[PDB]
């Protein structure tokens, strides 16, 4: 309680943060992935809501 450390020198330093904001705007068409131009499939696909 009777001794204090006081700065005698300092450094002004710059650090770097890499902080993601966004990602790649993908899209997959579900019908295409599953059935493509398959007729029976495209129709049955509906029955799954």
């Amino acid at each position: 309680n009777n001794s204090i450390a006081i700065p005698t020198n300092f450094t002004i330093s710059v650090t770097t943060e890499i902080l993601p904001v966004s990602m790649t705007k993908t899209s997959v068409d579900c019908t295409m992935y599953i059935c493509g131009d398959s007729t029976e499939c495209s129709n049955l696909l509906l029955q799954y809501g």
Binding site: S27, M32, G36, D37
Partner: protein, 49 residues
């Protein structure tokens, strides 16, 4: 021709309006959104093949 329409029924059960979902991109947005009202902007509505 056996085309897809968005049908809107009134209280009686009579169709009072409809969108021909194969007519023009704007009509396609309305059938995608299930509304005869769209907001100002851009919508993804289909992936053509």
């Amino acid at each position: 021709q056996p085309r897809t329409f968005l049908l809107k029924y009134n209280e009686n059960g009579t169709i009072t309006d409809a969108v021909d979902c194969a007519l023009d991109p704007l009509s396609e947005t309305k059938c995608t959104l299930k509304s005869f009202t769209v907001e100002k902007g851009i919508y993804q509505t289909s992936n053509f093949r």
